[PDB]
Amino acid sequence: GSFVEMVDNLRGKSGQGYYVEMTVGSPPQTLNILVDTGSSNFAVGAAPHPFLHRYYQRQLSSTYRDLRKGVYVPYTQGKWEGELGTDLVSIPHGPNVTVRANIAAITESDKFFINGSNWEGILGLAYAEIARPDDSLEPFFDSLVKQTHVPNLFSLQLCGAGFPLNQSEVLASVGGSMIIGGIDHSLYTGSLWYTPIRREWYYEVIIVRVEINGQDLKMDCKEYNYDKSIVDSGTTNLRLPKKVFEAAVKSIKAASSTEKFPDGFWLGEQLVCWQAGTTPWNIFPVISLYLMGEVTNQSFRITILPQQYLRPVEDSQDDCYKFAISQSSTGTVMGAVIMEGFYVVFDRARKRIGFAVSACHVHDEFRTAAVEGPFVTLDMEDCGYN
Template sequence: MNIVWRFILNILAFMMVAGDIPFDKIDKSVKIHKYSLYRVHKWKENNFQNAPSELSTRIDRMRGFPDIGYAIHITVGTPGQQFNALVDTGSSNFAIAASPNAGVPSYYHSRRSSTFQNRSQQVTVQYGKGTWTGDLMSDIVHLDVGFNRAIRQDFSGTPTKTFFDQLVDKTGIANIFSLTLYGPVLSKGLSWTSKDSNYGGEMTFGGIDRTLFLGHVYYTPVIKKWYYEVKLLNISVDGKPITMCCHGYEKYVTFVDSGTTEIVVPPAVFRTIVHSLQKFIQAPKLFWEGREVICPAGLGIAWSSLPIIEFTLPLAGVDGVLAYESSRFNLAISPQQYIRLSETVRNLGFPCYTFSISPSSNDAPVIILGDALMEGYTVVFDRINNQVGFAVSRFAAKNLTVSPGINRLERVKNGSLNIQNISSSSEDSVAIVSVVLASISLFMTCISIGVMTCIYFNHHRNKSSNDYPYRQVSSPHHPPAYSNAEEQYGSRDNSLADNGPTESD
């Protein structure tokens, strides 16, 4: 069993505070506030750490190769101590390293902060594999995102309103946020598509920024609010469903988790996926196990020849319009999402790739829709209606050879096809606060636990009705997922907003 140290920080966990936040400083006439973040790397195996300040281009034989996550930059304490905060929708605690360790380049010094308060309480968190333990404490956290200056992360026995609740109450923004993660991609000539290699996407508070995606937002219900748990109905490879015995996928808990780089599936499903892909691509066993990279020379990988992998979810609605009962939709991910470009490893100038699907452990029946899947979409976390939405990312559609897609499925009865008319709703007339993300590990949860815990490295964590057939609905508004972006969306590219991503951005 690999021991995984993970620096975990929950943005929404900032939000348990005592006292008022200075929202009067907000310029409410400005609807979108952007904050530049930093691209850093985390180690694939030993990654309970702040991201390293310098990017490594080598493979560490002990720790594997650097992995990409998504983070924001924060300061903690007075004077402020800087950290890279992993934004993770699959965690609920604000935890920070507070003692030296070989895998941690910097840590929180409580004695150097004049605003530090010790709560004299120990906290232990148990995961599917591994635990961590730390001391409960309080200090000032600064997140420079326009609406937020400095707030105290206070954890007394008296419940207080979360940061996000105060933000909603005092600014009138909607109780919703979204993530658009930009995975590493190559443009023509094997160069990075972004001028600034640190740029890794956007995070939006209070509404939806429609310049970031194409088409509609397809929502699936959150079945448990503790985390963003959704119901997965099926997984298909190249149009062929992978069936499971004994209650199928229902016995697995499925999370939408920005803190996990890979897509995690049941072991039997993993073996079927690998067996299917081995017909198309020759790679050593260690590649499929996630322990080696492949670096094809010449023209590289023929992406259009590789199969699409689809994840089927219940459809709650599209752009606010309720769907018929038992409607479904498929998230069709591109081969460039499950065979992911390594940003840090090259071989004689040729790009290298990692396999971004891994099996869950037998004692942890979970399915994780991690960054590898999320990077194809804008993912909307609608806390008002308890649902998670997906829309095809403009960045992914424009920069990937094979675009990700979304296919809507409707129930067919007596040979007829029920198709619901869908119209795009106007953009929410609320204040929208956007945060520019850097490609690094980050996390957020549906419910914030109000815990700032200092970890002293004596702990570890490894985070790791069907009576009738269904038929795909194809229309100009619901194109098949497998086409190239130019074929799929045509002239839509001409309507890109000035602040939308382009090949040169």
């Protein structure tokens, strides 16, 4: 229904991620926490760092419990190393509950913390399977559901501004909403359409068809989910497997052919600028992703605009952007590019993910983002990779 206490509780932008305010310890220590559906650890800065304005101080918390166990989390972009423990955790603009959760106290990190970001930790919302060191470390959401009456579901509305936000603006602006234990009807328009969670590790989904301006990409559907397709709030871009990316970029260049862009723009490296208010949105195509439906032989589609896939950046009074669709060697990643177009319901209780047109998506007077169905699709289980 309505969860007014949790509506507008996020801040940030796609390129830097979105964070929620949380408290750790007794007396409560306030920290800004990155919302990450692509990882399963709750981990906070717990030692001084040049990019941290604050950090978790275990010796000042009376409820802190040392697990006497190390935790190492190397990833593609960087790494962090810490010490496992437990403490009492709350979400001020969240449910009115206090939970004892696992905390990875970060003591050493490489390329993890970001200069100028207003976050000090990460909230891994995915399943116990991918948690580090192993699945025995109960993720935050599992502890919250086990210890309280909070329904096993969360929903995210990530709000892209559609223009650059400076440091004071990104601090004063509402970046979106994280609704813990419910679906807020004010954050979306139209219907919610659900896709099954294929397996509970990452939030894995199955893409069954891809269109660029209604034109079928015409690849074997396994290619779209090779080696997996996941919904990840901790990824800025829409990331596509190498073969899909090459086919998508060729189609997008063909649809936008009235204007020639250098190779560096398509690589996500170079920005493209237009005179204030003159971005030619109409020359760029819409992108539709068809997802497996809940009903046998049934699919639905989510459609995004270049206002989602052209990430706004500051250069001048020019309107500048980076191409936010990139190659992946780890399958499809429906990051902030997708997320910003839609209100996304992570229905863990019914092993499904919901999509509806976001009330905060950026569009123009001619086109809007869309969630439509049903469509008749066959051999959909065959689209999943093994």
